[PDB]
C-alpha cells in the first residue's frame, strides 16, 4: 500500500474504535485507515482554582480503561491511535493558558494520558471552548505556543496533530518559537471541502480534504481523494465512521489514494 495517510476520527461516545481495522485493501495492500483518533477528551475548567484540566467523559474513559480490547487490536494491525482534545464550553481553551507553567501542567496531563494508555499521540481541536466563560481570558499570544512546546518536549517520539480551526491555529509563534514544525499533521476541519491548512508544514503533513463518512457523498469523497494526490498532499482526513457496512464510502477514497478498493470483514 503506497499513498496518502488516511485518518479516521471515531465518535466514541456512540461508536466503536474497532470499526477502523475492519477495512483493508482488496489488492492485499493493507489497512484502508492508517490513523484512528479517539474523539474526544475535553479541556475543562476548575473555576475555584482557576485552572484547566484534561477532562474525560465516562464513555471516553471506558475506551481508555479497556484499551487492550478497544485500541490494541488497531495498533497490532499497524494503525496508530491518537486521542483528540476539544473545548468543552468551559472558557478554558488551548489559546487560553495564562502562563507557561499553566500550559505546561496541562501539557503533562496530555503526555501522561498517552503514556498510561499506550496511545500514539495527541490531536488538538480548538472549538467549543467558549473563551471567556467562568471569567477566563480571551485568546492570548503565548498560551498555545507554550502548550505545544511542552507537549512536544514531553513526548518527542509521538504524533501531535491539529485541526486547522480556532484561535490556537493562528497563534503558532511567540517568543523565539514557532510551534508549526512541532506538528506532524494538520487538517481541514470542514467536511466535504478542500481547504489547504495555512501552517508552515510540508504537503505530506497536510490534509486539505476533510470528509464525513456517511454524510458526504461518494463522488465528493472520490474527487477530494483524487485531488489530494493530484496536488501533492500526503494526508486524508475521514470523520465519523460507524459500525455499518461503509465499504463503498471507503473504496471511494482508497481507489484514488491507493488504486485499490476496500473489503470489509
Curated annotation (Swiss-Prot):
It catalyses: an N(4)-(oligosaccharide-(1->3)-[oligosaccharide-(1->6)]-beta-D-Man-(1->4)-beta-D-GlcNAc-(1->4)-alpha-D-GlcNAc)-L-asparaginyl-[protein] + H2O = an oligosaccharide-(1->3)-[oligosaccharide-(1->6)]-beta-D-Man-(1->4)-D-GlcNAc + N(4)-(N-acetyl-beta-D-glucosaminyl)-L-asparaginyl-[protein]. Keywords: Glycosidase, Hydrolase, Signal. One of its GO terms (cellular component) is extracellular region. GO terms for molecular function: mannosyl-glycoprotein endo-beta-N-acetylglucosaminidase activity. It comes from the Bacteria. GO terms for biological process: carbohydrate metabolic process. Residues 4-260 form the GH18 domain. Cleaves asparagine-linked oligomannose and hybrid, but not complex, oligosaccharides from glycoproteins. This is Endo-beta-N-acetylglucosaminidase H. It comes from Streptomyces plicatus. The chain holds residues 48 to 312 of 313 of the full protein.
Amino acid at each position: 500500500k503506497q499513498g496518502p495517510t488516511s485518518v479516521a476520527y471515531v465518535e466514541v461516545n456512540n461508536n466503536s474504535m474497532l470499526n477502523v481495522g475492519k477495512y483493508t485493501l482488496a489488492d492485499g495492500g493493507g489497512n484502508a485507515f492508517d490513523v484512528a483518533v479517539i474523539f474526544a477528551a475535553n479541556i475543562n475548567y476548575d473555576t475555584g482554582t482557576k485552572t484547566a484540566y484534561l477532562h474525560f467523559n465516562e464513555n471516553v474513559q471506558r475506551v481508555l480503561d479497556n484499551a487492550v480490547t478497544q485500541i490494541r487490536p488497531l495498533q497490532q494491525q499497524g494503525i496508530k491511535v491518537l486521542l483528540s482534545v476539544l473545548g468543552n464550553h468551559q472558557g478554558a481553551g488551548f489559546a487560553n493558558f495564562p502562563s507557561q507553567q499553566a500550559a505546561s501542567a496541562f501539557a503533562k496531563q496530555l503526555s501522561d494520558a498517552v503514556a498510561k494508555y499506550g496511545l500514539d499521540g495527541v490531536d488538538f481541536d480548538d472549538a467549543y471552548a467558549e473563551y471567556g466563560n467562568n471569567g477566563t481570558a480571551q485568546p492570548n499570544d503565548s498560551s498555545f505556543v507554550h502548550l505545544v512546546t511542552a507537549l512536544r518536549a514531553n513526548m518527542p517520539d509521538k504524533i501531535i496533530s491539529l485541526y486547522n480551526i480556532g484561535p490556537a491555529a493562528s497563534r503558532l509563534s511567540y517568543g523565539g518559537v514557532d510551534v508549526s514544525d512541532k506538528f506532524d499533521y494538520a487538517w481541514n476541519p470542514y467536511y466535504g471541502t478542500w481547504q489547504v491548512p495555512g501552517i508552515a508544514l510540508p504537503k505530506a503533513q497536510l490534509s486539505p480534504a476533510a470528509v464525513e463518512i456517511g454524510r458526504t457523498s461518494r463522488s465528493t469523497v472520490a474527487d477530494l481523494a483524487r485531488r489530494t494526490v493530484d496536488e501533492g498532499y500526503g494526508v486524508y482526513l475521514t470523520y465519523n465512521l460507524d459500525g455499518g457496512d461503509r465499504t463503498a464510502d471507503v473504496s471511494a477514497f482508497t481507489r484514488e489514494l491507493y488504486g485499490s478498493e476496500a473489503v470489509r470483514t
